[PDB]
Amino acid sequence: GFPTELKPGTNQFLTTDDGVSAPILPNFHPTPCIHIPGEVRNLLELCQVETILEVNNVPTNATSLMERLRFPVSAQAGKGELCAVFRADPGRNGPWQSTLLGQLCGYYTQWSGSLEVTFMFTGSFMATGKMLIAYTPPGGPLPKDRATAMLGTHVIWDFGLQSSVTLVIPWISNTHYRAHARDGVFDYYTTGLVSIWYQTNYVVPIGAPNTAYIIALAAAQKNFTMKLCKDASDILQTG
Amino acid sequence: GFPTELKPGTNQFLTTDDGVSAPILPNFHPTPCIHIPGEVRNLLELCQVETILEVNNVPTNATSLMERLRFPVSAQAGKGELCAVFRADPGRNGPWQSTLLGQLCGYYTQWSGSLEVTFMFTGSFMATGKMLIAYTPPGGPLPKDRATAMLGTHVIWDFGLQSSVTLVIPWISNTHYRAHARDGVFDYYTTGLVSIWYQTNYVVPIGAPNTAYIIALAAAQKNFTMKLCKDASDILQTG
Amino acid sequence: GFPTELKPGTNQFLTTDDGVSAPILPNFHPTPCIHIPGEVRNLLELCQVETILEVNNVPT
Amino acid sequence: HSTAETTLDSFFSRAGLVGEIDLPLKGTTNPNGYANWDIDITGYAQMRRKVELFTYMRFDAEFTFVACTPTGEVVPQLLQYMFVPPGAPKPDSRESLAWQTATNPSVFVKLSDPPAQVSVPFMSPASAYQWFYDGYPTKDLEYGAMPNNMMGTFSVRTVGTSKSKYPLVVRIYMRMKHVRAWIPRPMRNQNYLFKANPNYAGNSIKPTGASRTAITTL
Amino acid sequence: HSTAETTLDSFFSRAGLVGEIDLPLKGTTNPNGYANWDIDITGYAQMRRKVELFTYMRFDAEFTFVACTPTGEVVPQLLQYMFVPPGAPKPDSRESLAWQTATNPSVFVKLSDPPAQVSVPFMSPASAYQWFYDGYPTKDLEYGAMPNNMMGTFSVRTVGTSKSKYPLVVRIYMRMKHVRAWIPRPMRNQNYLFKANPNYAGNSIKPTGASRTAITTL
Amino acid sequence: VAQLTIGNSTITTQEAANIIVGYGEWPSYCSDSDATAVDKPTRPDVSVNRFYTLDTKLWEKSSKGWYWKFPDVLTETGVFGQNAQFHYLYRSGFCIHVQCNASKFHQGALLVAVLPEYVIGTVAGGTGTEDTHPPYKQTQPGADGFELQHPYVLDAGIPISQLTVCPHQWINLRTNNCATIIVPYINALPFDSALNHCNFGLLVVPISPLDYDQGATPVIPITITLAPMCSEFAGLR
């Protein structure tokens, strides 16, 4: 016959090798692929969808869980008071775990791209005021007050004019390698910071609730990317 | 199927065979090669770089080691005196071991090409005189004096006119095979010889140091070549 | 993968089989063949050369 | 700049272990030197929650078979892996004529011979295997039962009339190839209780993720 | 007239032994019939000083696995070599579910089957594995620690539930392919003291090379 | 001779000796299609890119050598030490200029070179059995620099007899006083922390010892003037 020399690797079964194998049913014509609505092709499609960010990820009591979904603002907050705060950490625990984006991030090891958090004022329509939502880039420390936050990337939101406002988080990268406990994890360190202050107090006329809630939705821009699949989960199929 | 006949060699694992093997991560897109300054492609690039030749490779006392780097010339040397001497032996021990060239030569078995040793007078600027740097080709015996050296390839260097002078060593070849002890080593025998004589004495006016030092740098021309990798080293990774 | 059937003869080492084998030193560039006088190519060249015939092959 | 790692096919390839068969000599476990494994892709723990991201999918699956003794040792035993397509009848005994039905593909391989490997197609009669079904197949115990998702059965056994001389362990890996998916849906945040339904533990209802003290302390 | 032998790729190819795993039966050494080897290319003695000629490099590496018993004997044992990319979790026990994670490539090969062989790519997130780092990762014990140089971990183990019946030895060779390098620097002339730093022995400071009596006697 | 000015900084130097452009590349900028096209990296022109003239170190017979870390030498100093700290990323180049002011009666030779990722390895306890990590005053010595203790191994277990393999230039007193070098940004990354990572280090060692007869000034003022080239920053704090 024809001359050969088997090279090392012969007979190995690589869980990742993606060659072809013999068909079990050679004659079988599998029922045709028809048209189904909403076909997903690449997962990054889903990363660009907005999902509620549980910023108020504090109540854990079983029937208050519907509250992590929206934080509130009220008349009782003096001008300059810190309303809320969280980091630009899609992967790591906390608020981002509720967002779909965060959830996908868990099947990947590295990633980077611009994020986008949109806020929604769902209070009475008769309410007005202003909020100062500031972003303190990675490394920068949470501004001491509303004034110092007013000197860095910020946005005065008059929920009196527009019911919605969207903020773009320029960049976040989870690529710096950490070999802490004994388990080497690829962590941020790029914990950007989003602070929210009462620029003015909550002004509402008589007859309107003195407390409104705000919902914060999040998604990743189109410049987003992920690398290295890493199947991981606390919820697996039970016996 | 298709007819074959496995030939001898089948299943062997050659540390040198450079075939291809199955990728462990088929989907993985490794982070892009960006532009980094000073990229080295072939090692011979480094062999053409000048590195200090420890001609004065005699002091070994820990804090005098900075002296092997430069030998001296002084008023006290009479006309014709031998200032220094060494061989054209990049591989073999001694002065050349300090040069980068010499160091690379150790990962190779055979080699040949023209060398180039440049001298630097780093004395007072008020000094003058002349040196006679002669090359006695392989086989030729060290000239008895300054006169007999003056009859063979030589150069009168007036460190009074030019602060630097470069000498070319025409050729050296480490290819003659020697099976001495029981360990077969590929050695020169082409030990060319570079002698350096005081053509005149060191003339310096009042107020100037009566001793200057000279630094000798070395590199190999472009006609240089190396053959047969031979990993060897006294310094290996420790436990 | 691709379908095969090993035929008899597989694994045999024929002292005469002249196939190719893997190079031990893949990077090595052996020193160049220069010109040497009198190169012999076929032995019959030598058979046409005269050599003394010991006809008197008797004294020992 | 590239985004190929996040494609469905990428996300899902890789052979994952979805099944393990024990064929001990002395045992309560598969006493007849044979076994039946209706093909379940939930065998790979991780898998259940991953696929349940979508409602409809479609794919082919390359199976590879790794067999040895418990110490992970190799032996001179022959084996018959048989595939009983959905609809065909599974062998009830170590001598059920189902072992001989030609329409039940079978691949014979010696334990020594590297892993046997075969591709199985998109069986389902429906245009897609669908993970959720809001109805009943024509309070009932048949809710959410999408039937037409059967991939088949894999019958494994030592070859021969007599019991095999050794204790054996077959492992079934599965690479999913040519994956297409539709209708995406909320990632399971609650622990799984049963293979069939989304039934969760109404007592142990946990927040999707970690919590903190105040919405002002990071 | 040719100069191909002195090219970087030439200088660096060749599979060199960078690792050896002992999986004895009776032992203090790897008592659980399994082992974890974070990929270190300094395993080949010679290698450390060679690569440290440059500051930045880049490459792929083909690994070949040679396994047998201490007498250099072959046996009917199956093996699972697993690669846990950086970031993934290493197996802590001979039954850690890490052995089953699909995203941890695994190649199964019988000891008899010739050496298994696979190519691993340029992992690093940085544009190049860099040998020296003049800083700290965001007097400190973290100086010169360039993190993003992790190639992964190689988990080796006998296959199966039970301990393997034989004493085993795996050897890991590594050919470096497609090598590119930048910024050249002074050849290490002082003995190496630790894997992490250039720390040398301030007492035993030796002249780069041999010495002589006078600068006039050859 | 002729004097050059970059802002309020006016140094007096020689016409134009031979400059050394490290690795033949010129400290250029980083184009728009990079990793951060959102947070436009502002390129300091005004005063940020001007002449910084450091505390002149004095040469002696006994001097071992000196080294500074970059960008550490300036993250302390001026309006560039303002941006280096209160900014998240950095990429820069450097026109380094080293001068000696000595008479035609002193003699010596200085090798001046730049070494990327100059990682200082200490002595390690002496016998070799102490894994001591160099202090923070040795790892990042500010604009006062630092004196090598083991010039022969460059305090890093490497022969200096080979340092010429890096961008270098010589300062032989009998031939020249000024020595200049142009360094392009070098790192495995387009940007990087200007505080946690010293891309490189300036090394200036006396290879031929300073000498002079009695009476001549015993020290040679080595003045190091340097300036940033096409430097870039990104992400204020």
Nearest in space to F41 (alpha carbons), one of F89, F95, F103: F89
SS3 of D111, please?
coil
- Within 8 A by CB and 6+ apart from D62, the residues are A20, A21, D15, D117, D118, D119, D120, D174, D175, D177
Q: How far is C16 from chain A (nearest CA, A)?
A: 15
Answer whether B13's CB lies under 8 Å from B21's CB: no
Q: What is the CA E45 to chain-centroid distance, rounded? A: 10
Residue span of the structural domain in which D23 resides = 1-218
Contact D184, D11 (CB under 8 A): no
Residue linked to tokens 């909550």: A202
- Of all residues in chain C, the one with the smallest CA distance to E10 is C27
The beta strands (E) that lie in F117-188 are given as 168-172, 179-183
Give, as one character, the DSSP assignment of residue A100: H
Which residues touch C31 (CB under 8 Å, ≥6 apart)? none
Q: Considering CB atoms only, which of E132, E135, E139 is closest to F135?
A: E139
- Among F199, A71, E144, B86, which residue's Cα sits nearest to residue D215? A71
Looking at A34-179, list the stretches that DSSP marks H as alpha helix, in order from N- to C-terminal side.
44-47, 100-105, 146-149
The token duo for E182 is 């930048």
CA angle (B127, B130, B136) in 5-degree steps: 145
* Burial (0-12, 13-18, 19+ Cβ within 10 Å), B14: middle
- A228: chain E residues, CB-CB within 8 Å: 85, 87
Query: Of F223, F199, F7, F9, nearest to F110 (Cα)?
Result: F223
How many other C-beta atoms can be found within 10 angstroms of the C-beta atom of residue B87?
21
Q: Check CB contact under 8 Å for F88 and A141.
A: no
Q: Which residue in B120, B140, B142, B116 sits closest to B131, CA to CA?
A: B120
**Count of other CB atoms within 10 angstroms of residue A81:** 16
Two structure tokens written together for B38: 């000073």
Query: Backbone dihedral region of B42: left (phi > 0), alpha (psi from -120 to 50 degrees) or beta?
Result: beta
CATH of residue D33:
2.60.120.20
Q: 10 Å Cβ neighbour count for A224?
A: 21
Taking contacts as CB-CB distances below 8 angstroms, the residues of chain C near A3 are 19
Amino acid at B41: R
- Domains of chain F with CATH codes: 1-237 (2.60.120.20)
CB contact under 8 A, A176 and E87: no
Do residues B156 and B131 touch, judged by C-beta distance below 8 A? yes
Helix (H, G, I), strand (E, B) or coil at E81: strand
Residues from chain A contacting residue C19 (CB–CB below 8 Å): 3
CB < 8 Å & 24+ apart, contacts of D24-29: D24/D167, D24/D168, D25/D163, D25/D164, D25/D165, D25/D166, D25/D167
Where would I find the H helices in A28-166? 44-47, 100-105, 146-149
Question: What is the 8-class DSSP label of residue E128?
Answer: S
Listed residue (A81, A82, A78, A106) closest to A92, CA to CA = A106
**CB burial string D159-179: b at 16+ within 10 A, e below:** eeeeebebbbbbbbbbbbbeb
Enumerate neighbours of C (3 or more CB pairs within 8 A).
Answer: A, B, E
Q: How far apart are CA A140 and CA A36, in angstroms?
A: 48
Give the angle subtended at the CA of F195 by the CAs of F193 and F199, to the nearest 5°.
70
Task: Calculate Rg over the CA atoms of chain D.
Answer: 21
Run of H or E including A96: none
Q: What tokens does A164 get? A: 């919605």
Tell me the one-letter amino acid at D90. K
Measured between alpha carbons, how far is residue B178 from residues B53, B69, B113, B192, C42 in Å?
Answer: 27, 31, 20, 18, 35
Q: What share of chain B is helix, strand, coil (3-state, %, to 5)?
A: 10, 35, 55
- First-to-last alpha carbon distance for chain F, in angstroms, is 43
For E117, residues 6+ apart whose C-beta sits below 8 A from its C-beta are: A7, A8, A9, A12, B13, B21, B22, E62, E63, E64, E65
- Using DSSP's 3-state secondary structure scheme, residue B148 falls into helix
Instruction: Write the class of the CATH domain A1-239.
Output: mainly beta
CA dist., res. B211 & res. F211, Å (int): 9
Amino acid at E51: V
CA–CA dist C6, F128 (Å, integer): 61
In angstroms, the Cα distances linking B142 to B82, B176, E212, F202 are 11, 22, 17, 43
Nearest by Cα to D34 from D165, D173, D159: D159
Which residue bears the tokens 């003695």?
E45
Which ranges constitute the DSSP H helices of F76-228?
A: 136-139
Count of structural domains within chain E: 1
Cα–Cα nearest to D77, from D29, D28, D25, D27 = D25
Query: Which H/E stretch holds residue C50?
Result: none
> Counting Cβ atoms within 10 Å, is residue A180 exposed (0-12), middle (13-18) or buried (19+)?
exposed
Cβ-nearest to D73 among E100, E108, E165: E165
C16: number of Cβ within 10 Å: 4
Interface test with D, best of E159, E165, E168 (most D CBs within 10 A): E159
Q: Inter-chain contact B29–D4, Cβ cutoff 8 Å? A: yes
Q: Do F175 and B124 touch (CB under 8 A)?
A: no
Q: Which two tokens stand for residue F21?
A: 């452009």
E126-164 b/e with 16+ CB inside 10 Å = b? bbbbbbbbbbbbeeeeebbbbbbbbbbbbbbbbbbeebb
Alpha carbon separation from B239 to A214, B231, E157, F224 (Å, rounded): 60, 19, 24, 43
Separation of alpha carbons E185 and E183, rounded Å:
7
> What is the C-alpha radius of gyration for chain F, rounded to an integer number of angstroms?
18
What size, in residues, is chain A? 239
Given a contact cutoff of 8 angstroms between Cβ atoms, the answer to whether B234 and B209 are in contact is no
Element (H or E) spanning F210, and its range? strand F200-211
Nearest alpha-carbon partner for F107 in F157, F175, F45:
F175
3-state secondary structure of E9: helix
F residues 216-235 lying closer than 8 A (beta carbon) to A: 235
d(CA E217, CA F59): 34
At position A77, the amino acid (one-letter code) is A
Give the angle subtended at the CA of A217 by the CAs of A212 and A222, to the nearest 5°: 155
Q: In what order do the strands lie in the sheet with F179-183?
A: F20-21, F179-183, F87-100, F220-236, F52-59
Way the structure was solved: cryo-EM
Q: Name every residue whose Cβ is closer than 8 Å to that of residue F85 and which is 6 or more positions away in sequence.
A: F75, F194, F195
CA R_g for chain A: 25
All residues of chain D having their beta carbon less than 8 Å from the beta carbon of residue B28 are: 5
- Position E135: which residue type? G
- Find the CB nearest A1 among C1, C9, C19: C9
Whole-number Å distance between alpha carbons of F207 and B216 = 11
Nearest to D11 by CA among A231, A15, A232: A231
The percent helix, strand, coil of chain E (3-state, each to 5) is 5, 35, 60
Q: How many CB atoms lie within 10 A of CB B60?
A: 13
Looking at chain A, after which residues does the C atom sit over 2.5 Å from the next written N, breaking the chain? none
Phi, psi of D106, deg, nearest 5? -140, 145
Question: Residue E11: closest CA among chain C residues belongs to which residue?
Answer: C27
User: Rounded to whole angstroms, how far apart are CA atoms A100 and D188?
Assistant: 11
Question: Residues D119, D60: contact at Cβ < 8 Å?
Answer: yes
Q: What secondary structure letter does DSSP report for D163?
A: P
Helix (H, G, I), strand (E, B) or coil at E43: helix
